[PDB]
């Protein structure tokens, strides 16, 4: 699998592929690895499917309980800290998962958490089997003076490179830009196909 | 000589301790709500206190989910602990079934909790009544959960000190499927006719939901219209 | 001076607390049912309340299985907790034996549970009586479980405030193996003659099962025929 | 002022609470049994109730094994829980020793259980007496276990409301080693002379065992002979 | 073993074979791997026999308790979520089972759950030893514009291919179409033999 | 006003509850025993009851080992539980030390058990006294353990309703080291002079042990000699 | 006759034990505080005791964080235990969320803890009221938590023996958003008008926080200015 | 009205229940002991009972070590349990430190144990006083441990019914460092002057230890010298 | 009628049980202490008892560390248990932080322990007051911890029966930073003026510490100087 998360000026963009295997044997050509975890932050998936979905369910539950107790959204440092403490209360029966949570509260963030609960701030991050490819292209092309359209084009070029050069990733890309103004918006697949055909990465 | 323990009936066969908890509910301020054409609302009277009070933490209406909400009356201590258990049971419900499918068994969990404490010695019951409200897979819902643990789902009620007068009004005036505004104003008139002479109805918190939407709380100036 | 604890007998040798729980059963609305030629039914009176009640959550009749079902009277709090334990014991029974083979020990589990609380101090009993009914490997079954834990298994009873008048009627009118409809109408007449003068019998919930079939609940207009 | 707790003696030195449990036994219907030439029987009076009663679950006689069986009187609630513990202790006994070798310590397990609750506060005892009967490695056995926990093995007794009159009859009429039929008819006469004037003895359940055989329950028409 | 589950327009079709081994040594030429789990959804079996039957018993019990508490049938997302949480509360003493639950609530679904509790939505799925064969023929012939008869013919062709090209699967096929209209109907074996003799896959 | 709880002393400083348990011992039948030249015996009065009683389970004398044995008086329920704990403690003692080396700490275990229940609220003590007897590494032993837990080892005592009259006799007639028969007849005369006028001494159970031998119980006709 | 247990209501429906804990709060010295333009302060009266007191350990104001702080009145024992639970709760909150995001549920935890002890028998409540104050993600906060567990967040209050007179002053004199100094002097006048005649206001501890800053406690000579 | 629970003080401020345990000590027979030139002894009065008593198990003096020993008075039940706890604490002490280094904290373990039961409801204290005595790393030791748990370490005391008269004698006659024999005879005169008129001092058990030696108990004829 | 349980207030709002524990403190002998120029001392009155008493175990002053020490008054039983908990908490404190950094939270641990027992039913509080004293990272410290759990650190106090008279003296005579000797003699005069007429002040134990040094106890002849 692969993930990507890119922080720019006043937004943060995350995207995954949708191919679940679960065997060698690619079994599901349309899964779901990008989740809305709250109204201003989301969470991606790059690990064992069952453990990752249980962590998504628990974090949806805990953040909704949080916002319903305090009427304020959770800070991104707080959600990564909570996720780190949860993953590190059990590490000798651990969750084989590589999580990545990003979102905006007063400034956009994207955080990475490994299977032992190591939280660390960075402006662009990625996890999964097809991770070094998207790190390569993000290192080569990424600038922090981009717009939202330039950011999502960079994301689509990244995940397209990972699909062309990796076995585990593949299938249709789904992308969701989360910003302070419009809130959590997941792009429809028709606009994503339009961006792919505009960039000329289709075959 | 029998109204001392939670575990003893009278020779008539009554639980005077449970009924005294129901009396302790009666000392709290009136709060009502009804469902209408695609959704439910709630209304809660608040005699406006010390202006030092930040309004954020005197809301008798509380959001247990984006799709379930409720209101209390009675012992504010037990009230708060109850709305906490409502939230936590909503979370456990939502995670073992993917979503809050039925509001009814959220109210069941809360009612079984309030039930048990009417039974065992060394415990007193909760002196609070709760009026849950929301949207589920079935549609608009509106329960009321009393100290003993009776649940009766309504499409309108009150609780609190006015409850008899408000349900008396609604029992002879309320007509279902009103468009939201007209419903609210009927409920405001219901709340009005429960006060005593000379008392002027201050600004009450009111909030609603419609089918396919989340909650919203009318802010004080949207409330101010219906005065 | 002895009716204060669950654990003390009188010099006559009675358990006044247990009997007071039986008195608390008597404050609940009448519910009856009988078995007939291949199957059993149940009838439960409901004085129709606040029309605001969505009818779903005031059903005194409750399905504990597709093949066992029951009805309560008394403290609605304890009643609900009891029907929950009936369902859970039906599930554990069905998984340790592949199927609900005998209804009798489902009723045994419920009865031993209600039994134990008549014994230990620091606990009051359940103020509810339950009438189970269904189809097993043997056929039509119909128990009644009271607060103390007595089970006696009828082919007809009532519980509730009318219970004496209804069982008085059935004790001199009922005849076994009626075809379902005729049976229902006899039970309706039984329920009728338990009210007080002037009271008009409203619409009661009635449901049945026949050998080899699941339950069904007569909806209000199939009920409306026998008025 | 002392008959309130299970744990306090009188200045005479009596346990009034235990004796009141023995009084609660006395409110149950008479049941007797004796052993004879190679085996034991039991007789239990039943005033025939609602014909709605499926006879299967009002049998005061209950089979704890294919080779041990018993009968109760008193609180039907405690009675049922007791016959359950008798069955479970018979099973644990039979698995730790390959077979129910002695009936006496089955009755010991039941008696120690009933004993303990006469001792600790916060618990009331069992208001039931039990008459065990069967065949072991030694032969015919017949105990009686009372609320306090006393066991005395007899070759004949009763329990229940008649018990004094029945044991008064047997104390001056019974002769051992009767062939089964003659024994049963003697026990029927014993049960007869315990009723009050005008009362006609209805059909009582009677069952027996002989050395090398299992139980059988005389069905109602084999019972009907000895009327 | 093999399973198959196919979602079409307004129905969902599941089928298994019936051959249980339990050794190498095929021991039972007529088992049962297709179970009615509720009045509008069913569950198939492709794992260790004991663990799979215990999971079938527990899910029958829990869904019946559910419907008896709420008088509504369980959503398919809810039953897969429940099954995933149950399988992932114990994964270090795990159930060696590959479950597949399908059914219709307001739209037909068929879900797949591995031994670690990874739930994922897909329109056609299969599990068991003879799984890649039926995935091959479903990928080659499957279209979402089929009828119920075309669907069950595709299912019979699939499981017949898996029987002809696998050792673990075999024996008589049983199929149950679950739809919203007629509810759970399991086809009798005479109609299945008629469809086999019509398609000409008999020898 | 102080004889209600096990935990309260009087202003004299007495435990009236413990003493009432000692009074409850006094309602049981007399049982005595002494040691002699190489060994100890026991004698227990039995007013012969219902001939239905199989004699195997009314023996007040009970074998706790092949080399220790005892007899009770009081609440037969507590008595039985006590002789059970005596057997189990004898087993634990014998397995942790290879053999029952000293009878004294078997009696200690029993006495500490009976001790503790004279102390804690929510528990009543045992209304039984026990007279242990046997052969150890030291020789003939004969204890008596009362409800409070006092042990005093004697070379003769009684317990029960006669106890004062029997120990009064033995206190002025008994002489040590009698050959077994002469000892038994002295103890029989002791038991005789404790009855009331008109009462004829029936057949009492008597059993003995000598140094290097096991127990034996004199059967009824070896008993019948000393009448 | 009802003010003896925490678990019994009056026939009016009051909890006299809870209210007596509120009375035990009233015996402690007055302490007040308010929020202002960007931040909150606290004032606590101290009648200067034995000069032997090192001033460090009689501070009624206590720092629960660098950004939350509070003050007590009542049983100093319970007060101290409470401020300990406030600190530990702030730590757990800060570690599960990276920072003390909201002061409100620190106060909620303290309130639920104080709530629970007003409910269960065998426990008496805390006879202390607490006034929390600080800066969070929202801004200036100022709660008061009473014995029953009621929290109401103010922009000003007192607690203690003066509380009525101080809140009476603030209810007619206080005006929001004062620059810190002017606010303090208003609160000093508030504290002044709560004493009795002849009493001279000694030096009270006062401390404050502003948005983006930590606490500081005015030392005695910065306090000495406002005398 | 306050001498009923262990946990309630009087308005004077006394624990009447603890003092009643001290009264229960007063009903036991007198036992004394003192230290002298290199070592300590003990003396215990015994009114010689039933000659049937084997002397081995009525010794009020008991060896808790080869180097510590003690004597009791009061409830013989609690006394025995206490001397058991003294032995076990001596063993745990000796194994965690290689040897019984100080007698004082053996007496501390016993004292804290007896202390705790004077505090908690549902427990009554021990009605026994203990006088420990022995040789440690420091030398001759002699404590007394009362029901409340007070230890005061003497060079002489008594306990029991005489205790005031004996300590009255020793308070005006005893002189330290007597050679063992002279000390014993002084203590015998002390024990003598505590009896009532007409009573003849029987043979009391006496035992001693000297620095570097173990215990020995004077046998009855070495005792017989000092009569 | 309210001074019976630890958990009930009066309608004035007092804990009469806690106050009676404070009264039980008042029955113990006076003990004082103050800090001075670089360090603290303690003084404890002892009415000299039986010369049999080894002086090692009647010291009201006890060393909880080489750098913390304290003194008690009241129930000697609870007193001892308390000084034990002080030592153990000092050890746990010293191991989790490398050293006893602050004396204040040693006194906190002790006070929280004494606090909790004023709260829960079924427990009575400790009837002891403690005066801790020592040197920490800050310097000389001197607390007093009462039965309820109040800690106030002083630079001088007493406890016990004289406490009012001694603190009355110190409240009008004591001047800080006295060189050690002059301080001690002032404290001796303080102790003197608390006795009653005719009573001669015997030899009291006195001990001190200075900054950078350990404790020492003035032996009786260094004490004898200040008589």
Numbering used by the authors:
A (entry chain X), E (entry chain Y): 1 to 203
B (entry chain F), C (entry chain G), D (entry chain A), F (entry chain B), G (entry chain E), H (entry chain C), ...: 7 to 233
Excerpt from the paper describing this PDB structure:
In archaea, the 20S is composed of homo-heptameric α- and β-rings, and PAN (Proteasomal Activator Nucleotidase), a homohexamer proteasomal ATPase, is the RP found in many species. Unfolded substrates enter the chamber through a narrow pore in the center of α-rings, where N-termini of α-subunits form a gate to impede unregulated access to the proteolytic chamber. We designed and assembled in vitro various asymmetric archaea 20S, in which one of the two α-rings contains a point mutation, K66A, which prevents RP binding to the α-ring.
The first one is a wild-type homo-hexameric PAN ATPase, homologous to the Rpt ATPase subunits in the base of 19S in  eukaryotic 26S proteasomes. The C-terminus of PAN contains an HbYX (hydrophobic, tyrosine, and any amino acid) motif that is required for binding to the α-ring and opening its gate. We also determined structures of PAN-αWTββαK66A in the presence of ATP, without and with substrate GFP-ssrA, both to resolutions of 3.4 Å. Because of the symmetry mismatch between the heptameric α-ring and hexameric PAN ATPase, PAN does not engage with α-ring symmetrically, and not every binding pocket in the CP is occupied by a C-terminus of PAN. Thus, the density of PAN in this reconstruction does not represent its correct structure. Furthermore, the C7 symmetry averaged density map still shows rotation of α-subunits induced by binding of PAN’s C-termini. Thus, structures of PA26PANc-αWTββαK66A and PAN-αWTββαK66A both show that the gate of the distal α-ring is open even without direct association with an activator; this distal gate is opened allosterically by the engagement of an activator to the proximal α-ring.
